[PDB]
Design a protein around this motif. Structure first.
Motif, PDB file in Angstrom:
ATOM      1  N   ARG A 221      44.287  52.451  48.139  1.00 19.14           N
ATOM      2  CA  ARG A 221      45.611  52.370  49.014  1.00 19.14           C
ATOM      3  C   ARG A 221      44.981  51.240  49.988  1.00 19.14           C
ATOM      4  NH1 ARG A 221      49.348  56.248  51.964  1.00 19.14           N
ATOM      5  NH2 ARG A 221      50.929  54.629  52.658  1.00 19.14           N
ATOM      6  N   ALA A 222      44.178  51.588  50.693  1.00 18.58           N
ATOM      7  CA  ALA A 222      43.287  50.966  51.666  1.00 18.58           C
ATOM      8  C   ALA A 222      42.602  49.717  51.297  1.00 18.58           C
ATOM      9  CB  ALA A 222      42.564  51.753  52.801  1.00 18.58           C
TER      10      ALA A 222
ATOM     11  N   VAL B  99      38.263  67.177  53.593  1.00 16.66           N
ATOM     12  CA  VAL B  99      39.644  66.632  53.721  1.00 16.66           C
ATOM     13  C   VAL B  99      40.758  66.863  53.145  1.00 16.66           C
ATOM     14  CG1 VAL B  99      40.334  64.241  54.141  1.00 16.66           C
ATOM     15  CG2 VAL B  99      38.711  65.091  55.570  1.00 16.66           C
TER      16      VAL B  99
ATOM     17  N   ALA C 194      32.214  52.424  50.781  1.00 12.22           N
ATOM     18  CA  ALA C 194      31.664  53.150  49.129  1.00 12.22           C
ATOM     19  C   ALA C 194      32.452  54.016  48.484  1.00 12.22           C
ATOM     20  CB  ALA C 194      30.181  53.662  49.377  1.00 12.22           C
ATOM     21  N   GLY C 195      33.101  55.235  49.187  1.00 14.92           N
ATOM     22  CA  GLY C 195      33.762  56.348  48.608  1.00 14.92           C
ATOM     23  C   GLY C 195      34.004  57.187  49.856  1.00 14.92           C
ATOM     24  N   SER C 196      34.242  58.520  49.495  1.00 15.14           N
ATOM     25  CA  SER C 196      34.526  59.450  50.578  1.00 15.14           C
ATOM     26  C   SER C 196      33.888  60.733  50.430  1.00 15.14           C
ATOM     27  CB  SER C 196      35.959  59.530  51.007  1.00 15.14           C
ATOM     28  OG  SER C 196      36.448  58.159  51.697  1.00 15.14           O
ATOM     29  N   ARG C 197      32.942  61.209  51.120  1.00 16.61           N
ATOM     30  CA  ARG C 197      32.062  62.388  50.937  1.00 16.61           C
ATOM     31  C   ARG C 197      32.495  63.656  51.818  1.00 16.61           C
ATOM     32  NH1 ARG C 197      26.058  60.160  49.701  1.00 16.61           N
ATOM     33  NH2 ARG C 197      26.804  58.420  48.660  1.00 16.61           N
ATOM     34  N   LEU C 198      33.760  63.293  52.229  1.00 17.67           N
ATOM     35  CA  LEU C 198      34.413  64.529  53.054  1.00 17.67           C
ATOM     36  C   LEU C 198      34.880  65.247  51.894  1.00 17.67           C
ATOM     37  CD1 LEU C 198      36.011  61.774  54.914  1.00 17.67           C
ATOM     38  CD2 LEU C 198      34.465  63.231  56.091  1.00 17.67           C
TER      39      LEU C 198
ATOM     40  N   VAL D 193      39.896  49.314  49.909  1.00 19.10           N
ATOM     41  CA  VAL D 193      38.474  49.602  50.077  1.00 19.10           C
ATOM     42  C   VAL D 193      37.602  49.671  48.785  1.00 19.10           C
ATOM     43  CG1 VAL D 193      36.543  51.004  50.934  1.00 19.10           C
ATOM     44  CG2 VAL D 193      38.491  51.024  52.177  1.00 19.10           C
TER      45      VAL D 193
ATOM     46  N   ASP E  91      43.888  57.309  48.066  1.00 13.05           N
ATOM     47  CA  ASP E  91      44.043  56.536  49.411  1.00 13.05           C
ATOM     48  C   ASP E  91      42.970  55.540  49.692  1.00 13.05           C
ATOM     49  OD1 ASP E  91      46.366  57.758  50.368  1.00 13.05           O
ATOM     50  OD2 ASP E  91      45.372  59.416  51.484  1.00 13.05           O
ATOM     51  N   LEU E  92      41.803  55.862  49.127  1.00 16.55           N
ATOM     52  CA  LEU E  92      40.838  54.769  49.410  1.00 16.55           C
ATOM     53  C   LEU E  92      41.047  53.493  48.595  1.00 16.55           C
ATOM     54  CD1 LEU E  92      38.321  54.707  51.283  1.00 16.55           C
ATOM     55  CD2 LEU E  92      37.069  55.482  49.416  1.00 16.55           C
TER      56      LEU E  92
END
Ligand SMILES: [Mg+2]
Ligand SMILES: [Mg+2]
Ligand SMILES: [Mg+2]
Ligand SMILES: [Mg+2]
Ligand SMILES: [Mg+2]
Ligand SMILES: [Mg+2]
Ligand SMILES: [Mg+2]
Ligand SMILES: [Mg+2]
Ligand SMILES: [Mg+2]
Ligand SMILES: [Mg+2]
Ligand SMILES: [Mg+2]
Ligand SMILES: [Mg+2]
Ligand SMILES: [Mg+2]
Ligand SMILES: [Mg+2]
Ligand SMILES: [Mg+2]
Ligand SMILES: [Mg+2]
Ligand SMILES: [Mg+2]
Ligand SMILES: [Mg+2]
Ligand SMILES: [Mg+2]
Ligand SMILES: [Mg+2]
Ligand SMILES: [Mg+2]
Ligand SMILES: [Mg+2]
Ligand SMILES: [Mg+2]
Ligand SMILES: [Mg+2]
Ligand SMILES: [Mg+2]
Ligand SMILES: [Mg+2]
Ligand SMILES: [Zn+2]
Lengths: 51, 63, 132, 109, 343
Positions: free
Chosen positions: B20-21, B8, B1-5, B23, B17-18
């Motif tokens: 890049r991967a 980080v 989905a995304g990144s909720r951190l 996703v 980065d997401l």
RNA sequence: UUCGCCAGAGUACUACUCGCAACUGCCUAAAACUCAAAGGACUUGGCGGUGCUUCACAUCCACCUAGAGGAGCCUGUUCUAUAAUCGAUAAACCCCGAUAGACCUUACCAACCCUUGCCAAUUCAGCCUAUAUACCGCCAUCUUCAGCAAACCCUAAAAAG
RNA sequence: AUGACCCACCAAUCACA
């Protein structure tokens, strides 16, 4: 085993495509029997074959 | 989905980065805009420790 | 806790008919009577007979049309004839439905010695009032 | 500790194994003094058949008899071994079934 | 005695006794199991063991363009029909007594290591079939309630990843095990990290982290040395795409602190390009198998220094007595050399 | 940078030693044996002859009215008693299952009888036999108490809130 | 003032060829 469950697999010195699986790609050493899971008989057979 | 951190990285970091991967399959608007004229400081999370001991701030009094 | 004729609350997935969602204290207030006949009125007779007849009809119908009965039966009694009215799931081919209509009506007519009508209303799936 | 203190004590040394009921031997041979019964500890109950034996080391000790049923009288020689029985407090030895005067358990007939 | 009888639902509800007080406080054991079988499953309208054939029900209404009369089967014909029905029951009992195989994760009764399969599509239609999920820790957990007394929730801890460098973990908790599984999957996909992989098999450099009471220590391996790690770390690595690694965990092995600690650690990797840029030098890699030949891994985009690094005769670095003991052949443990199965 | 200490819990600020103006003493300090834990901090409950507020509306105290507990009867329990049912049996049993026992009811006791023995069929009918701690059905109770619960979201980790 | 012991959560379906 992997080798003895499928009887159509033959361990010879001849098929390299089979033997290749039991050697490391990078390190060129033969896996020990536990790593793969072959039975000691076939592992010895293999070692001699690869030789 | 995304990144909720939140802690980080920057939103920039996590987003790029997401992508890049592989996703996150669509690039968001603010991304291109960001790359173009990035902010002065990377907006990475930081914890505000209380000072201790002999340490004090650097702020100069104006005279 | 009163338990009578209640369908208890499940995890919230449970399909419930309009009938089953109303506890006995709602009879004559929200839901109505599954039977109609003269017998329970003030000056009238043979209530007992009609009660037994009723019980047998629900049982009989439930066994004659296995799996296809949607909601409980409706029994209207008028001037010596009983019209049974049912909600039926579509399961059987209309051959089996007409076979059972005729079979039933004749059978019960000869059993209870009065003309019996059967009225089938057909429904895709159990009508759902609540939860689900 | 500090490096001096660690120098001064030497490295830690693994203490030798403390010795048990069989005195470090795998079995012992012993004669039966008495046959009796002991209740287990609290949480779980039965009555367990034990004997008292005198062992070749001269030490006398309570010992337990496995299997269901047995024939053991005073003066029978048995061979005992080290397994400790968990229920019975105090009972650290076990008769070897199938040797000398303790015969193998007889299948129901 | 006909009035005295009931509905199937009533009778089964009765016999199963799922709604009793025994089931609630766990007042009876889980090895005791009984099930409900539909008794209408194989039956057809019109069928009876008297053997009749009714024009509308058992047999087609018209045969050869005419109306079939009410008729009855022969004795032996009914024998065969009942034989068929009996064999049908036996077939359904043969189907019921066969238990489907569960792929074993770590141990047979552990849920650890097991795959849940891809998380569920997000509300936007966004779909991950590239992600796998593994269970790390499932635990029955309790809370003392005013009314019910003990109250049992499952809480599971799960990790997802596509193998391409994005993985993340999350935890989820519910009364039902199934429910917590769902919850922790769908939640995991929301916290993803990107893990930078050197040459897409190892990590970049050695890592040592103390997260709470857990110490993880990882070392960067060459190409052939597969995944030598705590089993949880191997699971997570396989999800990230890290194929060659060595990690020793010490202190508390508590699972959540382990995966938090791990992700923290891996996240904080400093890439060769990053290093190149902050020092402003070439970072050059000497393989042992390639001899003295200086492979140039990273170059400092921007202006390179003309200034050499200060040469420290003797470095001041924190050393781990474990690594030093390893290097000098003072690790004699019988547990370390052991041959294990493949990664 | 040092030094002093610490290798599960008990046994044990104990037994033996050495020293000491201590002679029921201080100091130093084990083992057999027993256990599979012992510990530390927290969490939600529950509880508290703990404190502070606010209440009780037939309700605790203050207060009002009529009764019970003493008598005779009526009816139910417990005992004792009988060859001679069963069930309820703190609140939440006790004119309760019963809006109902002379025979019947009736399940009990004693004598006697009958063995495909209510039914279309059935190597089967039948069982007021045991288990309400296997249960459905009906309920009691906290209760005229306000909470229960799916689906989510948050927490430098989450037992839970 | 007092109130044996013992009580609890470690198993998986249905449906079709
Ligand atoms: Mg026991
Ligand atoms: Mg043993
Ligand atoms: Mg012999
Ligand atoms: Mg197993
Ligand atoms: Mg230690
Ligand atoms: Mg000790
Ligand atoms: Mg003292
Ligand atoms: Mg002393
Ligand atoms: Mg001494
Ligand atoms: Mg009062
Ligand atoms: Mg009076
Ligand atoms: Mg009075
Ligand atoms: Mg009186
Ligand atoms: Mg009585
Ligand atoms: Mg009884
Ligand atoms: Mg009683
Ligand atoms: Mg009570
Ligand atoms: Mg009588
Ligand atoms: Mg009589
Ligand atoms: Mg009887
Ligand atoms: Mg009960
Ligand atoms: Mg509310
Ligand atoms: Mg906290
Ligand atoms: Mg909550
Ligand atoms: Mg006392
Ligand atoms: Mg007590
Ligand atoms: Zn083999």
């Amino acid at each position: 085993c992997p080798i003895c469950r499928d009887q159509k697999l033959h361990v010879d010195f001849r098929n390299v495509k089979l033997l290749e699986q039991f050697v490391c790609a990078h390190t060129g050493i033969i896996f020990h029997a536990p790593y793969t899971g072959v039975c000691m008989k076939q592992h010895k057979k293999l070692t001699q074959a690869i030789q | 989905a995304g990144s909720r951190l939140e802690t980080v990285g920057s939103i920039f970091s996590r987003t790029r980065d997401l992508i890049r991967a592989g996703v996150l399959k669509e690039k968001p608007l603010w991304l291109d805009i960001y790359n173009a004229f990035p902010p002065l400081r990377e907006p990475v999370f930081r914890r505000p420790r209380l000072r201790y001991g002999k340490a004090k701030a650097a702020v100069q009094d104006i005279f | 806790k009163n338990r009578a004729a209640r369908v208890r609350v499940s995890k919230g997935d449970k399909p419930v008919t309009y009938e089953e969602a109303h506890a006995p204290h709602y009879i004559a207030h929200r839901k109505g009577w599954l039977s109609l006949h003269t017998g329970n009125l003030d000056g009238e007779d043979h209530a007992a007979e009609r009660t037994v007849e009723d019980v047998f009809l629900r049982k009989f119908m439930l066994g004659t049309f296995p799996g296809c009965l949607a909601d409980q039966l409706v029994l209207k009694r008028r001037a010596n004839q009983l019209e049974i009215c049912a909600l039926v799931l579509r399961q059987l081919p209309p051959h089996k439905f007409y076979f059972l209509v005729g079979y039933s009506e004749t059978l019960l007519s000869h059993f209870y010695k009065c003309p019996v009508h059967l009225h089938l209303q057909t429904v895709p799936s159990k009508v759902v009032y609540k939860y689900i | 500790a500090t490096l001096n203190q660690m120098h001064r004590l030497g490295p830690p040394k693994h203490p030798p194994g403390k010795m048990g009921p069989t005195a470090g031997r795998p079995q012992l041979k012993g004669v039966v003094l008495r046959t009796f019964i002991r209740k287990p500890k609290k949480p779980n109950s039965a009555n367990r058949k034990c004997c008292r034996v005198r062992l070749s080391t001269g030490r006398e000790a309570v010992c337990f008899i496995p299997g269901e049923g047995h024939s053991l009288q005073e003066h029978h020689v048995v061979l005992v071994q080290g397994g400790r029985t968990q229920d019975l407090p105090g009972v650290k030895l076990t008769v070897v079934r199938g040797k000398y005067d303790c015969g193998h358990v007889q299948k129901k007939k | 005695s006909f009035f005295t009888k009931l509905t199937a639902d009533e009778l089964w509800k009765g016999a199963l006794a799922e709604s009793g007080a025994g089931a609630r406080k766990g007042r009876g054991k889980r090895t005791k199991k009984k099930r409900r079988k539909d008794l209408n499953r194989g039956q057809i309208i019109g069928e009876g063991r008297h053997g009749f054939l009714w024009p509308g029900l058992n047999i087609p209404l018209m045969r050869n363009g005419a109306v079939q009369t009410i008729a009855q089967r022969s004795k032996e014909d009914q024998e065969k029909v009942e034989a068929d029905m009996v064999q049908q029951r036996e077939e359904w009992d043969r189907r019921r007594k066969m238990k489907v195989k569960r792929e074993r994760g770590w141990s047979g009764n552990t849920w650890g290591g097991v795959s849940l399969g891809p998380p569920d599509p997000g509300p936007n239609g966004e779909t991950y079939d590239d992600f796998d999920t593994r269970i790390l820790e499932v635990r029955n957990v309790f809370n003392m309630t005013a009314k019910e007394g003990r109250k049992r929730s499952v809480r599971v801890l799960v990790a997802v990843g596509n193998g391409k460098g994005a993985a993340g973990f999350a935890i989820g908790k519910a009364t039902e095990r199934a429910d917590a599984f769902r919850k922790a999957k769908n939640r995991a996909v929301h916290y993803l990290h990107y893990i930078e992989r050197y040459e897409d098999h190892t990590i970049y450099h050695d890592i040592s982290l103390k997260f709470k009471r857990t110490h993880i220590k990882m070392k960067k391996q060459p190409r052939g040395y597969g995944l030598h790690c705590h089993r949880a770390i191997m699971t997570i690595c396989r999800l990230i795409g890290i194929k060659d690694l060595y990690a020793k965990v010490s202190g508390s092995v508590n699972m959540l602190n382990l995966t938090r600690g791990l992700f923290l650690g891996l996240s904080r990797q400093e890439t060769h390009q990053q290093l190149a840029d902050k020092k402003s030098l070439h970072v050059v890699e000497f393989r042992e198998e390639c001899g003295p030949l200086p492979i140039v891994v990273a170059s400092p985009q921007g202006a390179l220094r003309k200034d050499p690094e200060p040469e420290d005769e003797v470095p001041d670095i924190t050393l781990d007595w474990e690594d030093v003991k390893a290097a000098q052949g003072m690790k004699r443990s019988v547990w370390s050399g052991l041959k294990r199965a493949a990664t």
